[PDB]
Symmetry: D2
Subunit: 209 residues, 4 copies
């Protein structure tokens, strides 16, 4: 592409028509609503867990995505590799806000279920989630052709679902819940990045970290 | 204010929590709604009229804002200096869209009223507004015999009001109309620029030109 | 195009590889250099003169660019329509800086020469340019196939040339002068906007106003 | 910190005066130059190693920065925790470009030295660095028996040094090498982010991933 592409002020100022929101705006929108269930995606929503998925790929399938169907990978991923996962600031702020509200907090992930998992502990510890707000992580798995999260959102009566992927937002849509998008960091190993805002949903500002 | 201030990617990626919308999205939101009255502020909403205001300030009050109280200025500004005003593309798109809907187009301005005005003609001609959708400019304000912008919005049953200033949005909200913000161009002489989105209202993307 | 196009943080943070500079950085780069000749383009560099060109087009050739070859247009443009031209802040700052330096200031424009012109006066007055730094505007004209500015930059020994158009920067290149780009405002009627930085030249930050 | 802070187009279009460059532009600047030594900082320059530093801080000093002085941490960090570090694309492109030139690739780190290290292997493997271009990581610093980064750049005749921290740029400048800045990712745990461009140096676009 051109050595010196240049730019112009129409481009510099250009904004995609995205419904951006802040955590404060979300909290304000909920003012006075009693405790309810809310849910969070995990990967690239509350944890930058690319370190573990990157290790998994290099270890289990350097040339493919097969590691994601490998039980030996999931056993490592769910039982300690989140020691290297970096909690997202947007998640600290959202989880603190939902604890303030007295909301029930659920995590619903496309990760595969394993025999044991330490992920619930990592989340409760890192985010300072009290026992009463915390719920064990739901490992909904990944099955092409099905949104495995939708039925879980329904079963737990989740009213807000935060996530980075299109299927997080459409899971919320499927059940009539409010789907709010978090930006996936640009150094995530899960590419391409989704188009945040592509269902006209709210997207949290500065939510890449 | 360092010579080399530098930057960082948090700053570079930072977004204000604005509800950005497009003309297409606004149109979509009105699908199936019958013809209705809509209204526009003039200055920095549909016309970049700073050229006449710049000339007016230079000619009539170079050291103050007194020109805005000078009938000699307004007679000039409302009877031909808009030949030098630059129509905004955002306004061309909105007015085309509303005309296509069969909506009534109103312009409500805080410009001081004059004996005659040719601003209505300028607007109909520049924006190709059909006679059936066109309405003579309304001069609203707080002088004896005048009615306020809010009062005129109620009178004409204006359901959507477009403008760049805080007072355009509040005038709409006070009567329960939908106030939609247009960005004031950075080379406008009316400074400082407003904080578009300051009341949580919709702001049209790229609406500075 | 899509109703809800969305975005992602790689896009939000993306920067074109442009050599951006500030006026302070330019002045610093010149520290200790004795008085020299410098030159400025006029339209969209020091004056937002779109009001006059817009009036000219609508008056003289609503359906074409023929007004730009019409002597009756130029006579109006160069003898008063700049009363509506809005001086650029970047130009105030650059002209003040060159006056500080004791530099000779030239304006070299692609506007056509007329029998009389009041543009030199408008510039000296609006920018507070002292007699000794000021020089009468050079109306170099426009002739496809020739950069009419290059020979003028050579004749006046201009060492820095500021401008918004590609031919301003290449005029400076032609003569071995330092060509520095100003951003053309997005509400200029001269479209399309140039790609600032496309010759790897310095571009002044925030220079659209 | 208003609930609805709004924005304006001056802010939206605002650019810091940074000398942005691309990898293509850097390569172009070296055209015809024979093979030379170039060097890279490691952390947040070529590896997003925050996962290991995050784990290290949690494990060894949750309430302080003491882990960076703890030999037990460094033995872990330099002997396998980089399996969880994420290579930066900007580094893949730069290292490919320099390898293609036949340049010598050096890595100079302020990480504390350890009895053994497998970081050199991680870097050669991840970046596909041929044995003829590869050099074992240099641990530079101010401990007895060590030499500083500046000293190592002189020793190896490193002509270009890439890094994200101020000290990477100053170490280059102190010995007359070309210091080129890479953006630290916003989800790095090393905070605050540096002001890339703080010394007027080149900064690589989009170099946060
Ligand atoms: N420099 C400017 C530009 C626009 N306006 C607005 C638009 C109306 O014409 C006028 C109403 O007083 O003020 C202004 O006050 N000053
Ligand atoms: N959280 C972090 C991340 C990186 N570094 C840098 C990179 C080197 O590994 C180390 C040198 O002390 O510090 C750090 O100090 N702290
Ligand atoms: N590089 C990858 C690939 C997948 N996943 C996540 C998203 C899915 O929900 C789950 C199974 O694919 O793991 C991830 O975080 N990073
Ligand atoms: N819409 C336009 C068209 C032209 N010009 C300028 C640039 C040229 O130098 C000169 C003759 O075209 O006028 C302008 O400012 N605006
Ligand atoms: Mg996810
Ligand atoms: Mg207005
Ligand atoms: Mg010009
Ligand atoms: Mg570093």
């Amino acid at each position: 592409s051109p050595l010196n592409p240049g730019t112009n002020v129409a481009r510099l100022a250009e904004q995609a028509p995205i419904h951006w929101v802040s955590v404060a705006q979300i909290e304000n929108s909920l003012a006075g609503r009693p405790p309810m269930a809310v849910g969070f995606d995990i990967d690239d929503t509350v944890l930058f867990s690319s370190p573990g998925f990157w290790r998994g790929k290099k270890t289990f399938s350097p040339e493919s995505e097969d590691y994601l169907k490998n039980p030996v990978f999931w056993e490592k991923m769910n039982n300690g590799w989140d020691e290297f996962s970096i909690p997202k600031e947007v998640a600290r702020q959202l989880i603190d806000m939902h604890v303030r509200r007295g909301d029930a907090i659920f995590f619903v992930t496309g990760r595969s279920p394993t025999k044991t998992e330490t992920v619930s502990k990592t989340l409760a510890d890192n985010f300072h989630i009290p026992a009463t707000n915390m719920n064990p992580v739901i490992f909904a798995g990944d099955k092409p052709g099905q949104n495995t999260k939708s039925q879980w959102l329904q079963d737990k009566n989740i009213r807000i679902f935060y996530g980075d992927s299109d299927n997080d937002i459409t899971a919320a849509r499927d059940v009539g819940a409010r789907g709010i998008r978090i930006l996936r960091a640009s150094n995530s190993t899960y590419k391409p990045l989704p188009q945040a805002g592509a269902f006209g949903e709210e997207v949290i500002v500065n939510s890449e970290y």
